[PDB]
């Protein structure tokens, strides 16, 4: 009774489509849902949780010993404590973080990151550190005086135990994205020596955390390359047998 004509692209299976389907087993009531505490509706609130960074960039370090950097009594003034390249979708300190793992599922990311450092020495340990941030266009400083030229914060961990610095807003896609890195650096230098009492240990440790702010954005979901398709797992034919 209704005259119709078929359109081009009819009877095609498009893997990304939103069409109602015929409900197999109708008139079956599923188990009513109750309140399970802790529910994630958006993946953004997942990346807004701080995660430990692999500050110790030395290739020799493996396991838990690459989660901390050691400040010894022989570290000497004016030495680069650590260098953190600011590139989420790149191997480095942020590769194994929550923000890095989630961002590896997408193509375009933009927003501001926040970084927190915690000092884990003795109660009587004292000293000073210089934390330097360089904009995406530039080179990581090598020495203290050229580090002091740019934006920096002097951290006295004798009184304060944690320091937080906010990375300014950055759009990773424009800055390269196979332009065919250097999106920015965070460096630390020793302003003074580490002063500890004789009874305490002469070596102290530092750990760092990273998290995304509320302006973070992700787009164009892709396939994470983190884990590769294993030819076959141990029990694989059980589902078919």
């Amino acid at each position: 009774g209704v005259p119709t004509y078929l359109l081009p692209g009819s009877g095609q299976f498009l893997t990304t489509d939103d069409h109602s389907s015929a409900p197999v087993l109708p008139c079956f009531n599923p188990t009513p849902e109750m309140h399970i505490p802790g529910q994630v509706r958006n993946m953004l609130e997942v990346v807004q949780v701080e995660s430990m960074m692999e500050i110790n960039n030395t290739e020799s370090a493996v396991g838990m010993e690459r989660l901390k950097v050691d400040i010894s009594a022989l570290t000497d003034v004016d030495q680069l404590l650590f260098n953190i390249p600011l590139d989420i979708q790149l191997d480095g300190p942020l590769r194994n973080t929550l923000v890095g793992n989630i961002s590896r599922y997408y193509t375009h990311w933009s927003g501001s990151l926040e970084m927190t450092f915690m000092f884990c020495g003795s109660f009587m340990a004292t000293g000073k550190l210089i934390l330097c941030y360089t904009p995406p266009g530039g080179s990581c400083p090598t020495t203290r005086e050229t580090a002091m030229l740019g934006t920096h914060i002097v951290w006295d961990f004798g009184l304060q135990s944690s320091i937080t610095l906010i990375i300014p807003w950055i759009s990773g896609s424009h800055y390269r994205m196979f332009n065919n890195a250097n999106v920015g650096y965070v460096t630390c230098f020793m302003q003074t020596n580490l002063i500890v009492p004789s009874e305490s240990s002469d070596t102290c440790s530092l750990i760092g955390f990273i998290a995304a702010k509320d302006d973070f954005s992700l787009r164009l979901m892709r396939d994470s390359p983190d884990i590769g398709q294993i030819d076959h797992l141990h029990g694989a034919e059980a589902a078919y047998q």
């Binding site: 009877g11 095609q12 299976f13 893997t15 990304t16 389907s21 015929a22 409900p23 197999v24 087993l25 079956f28 599923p30 188990t31 009513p32 849902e33 109750m34 399970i36 505490p37 802790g38 529910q39 994630v40 509706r41 958006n42 993946m43 953004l44 997942v46 194994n96 929550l98 793992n101 599922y105 997408y106 954005s217 992700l218 787009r219 164009l220 979901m221 396939d223 994470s224 983190d226 884990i227 590769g228 398709q229 294993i230 797992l233 141990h234 029990g235 694989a236 059980a238 589902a239 078919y240 047998q241």
Partner: protein, 216 residues
């Protein structure tokens, strides 16, 4: 901000099974349990990518949408004359847990009225049906820190709940004089997804499907 919702993050159609079976008239008794039909228990740990994506939350609640796309290739033998590919009809039966799964192509379980079936032809748009949430609990348990049975022999990490069911596909047609090779491709797409208790991602590639063993 809508692109990074959990529904859009997990509701992507992914190939979950790509088994193929022979069809020719096996006069001799050979190739048992796969003579003319294909059986697959509905799970999500088969493919590493989807398994890792799902293994980010402790609890999930979703409806599975199944699309079955099947192709027929000329039997790689006998006469090469391209007479054509006949319109074979197929039967896809969803067997929920607690029911009987067919063991042969001609078993009486294919005619059961309790199990819902879909009949479709080889020259039609691919069959599609959506399986509702079919767990006795309020949500699926991606991880289970417990033993299934009350005996100590019970396996670790296997929940007696969940276990959505089995999918059985067969060729309804009685054996033609010339056999054929049938490839069955089934896609699953979760819908109305709800997630709880996010978890850290998984490094250290998987060593098994049953458990979470690692090679460190």
């Amino acid at each position: 901000v809508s692109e990074t919702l959990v529904e859009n993050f997990l509701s992507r159609a992914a190939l979950v099974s790509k088994r193929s079976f022979e069809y020719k008239d096996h006069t001799s008794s050979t190739a048992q349990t796969d003579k003319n039909f294909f059986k697959w228990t509905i799970n999500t740990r088969s493919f590493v990518q989807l398994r890792r994506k799902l293994e980010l939350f402790t609890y999930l609640r979703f409806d599975a949408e199944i699309t079955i796309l099947t192709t027929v290739a000329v039997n790689g033998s006998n006469n090469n004359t391209y007479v054509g590919l006949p319109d074979l009809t197929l039967q896809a039966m969803f067997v929920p847990t607690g029911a009987l799964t067919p063991e042969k192509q001609d078993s009486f379980h294919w005619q059961s009225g309790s199990n819902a079936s879909v009949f479709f032809k080889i020259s039609d748009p691919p069959a599609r049906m959506t399986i509702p949430f079919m767990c006795i609990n309020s949500a699926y348990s991606v991880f289970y820190d417990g033993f299934a049975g009350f005996e100590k022999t019970g396996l670790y990490g296997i929940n007696p709940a969940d276990t959505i069911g089995n999918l059985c596909v067969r060729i309804v047609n009685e054996h033609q004089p010339v056999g054929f090779t049938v490839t069955v491709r089934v896609y699953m797409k979760p819908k109305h997804i709800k997630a709880w208790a996010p978890r850290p991602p998984r490094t250290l590639p998987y060593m098994s499907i049953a458990n979470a063993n690692y090679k460190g």
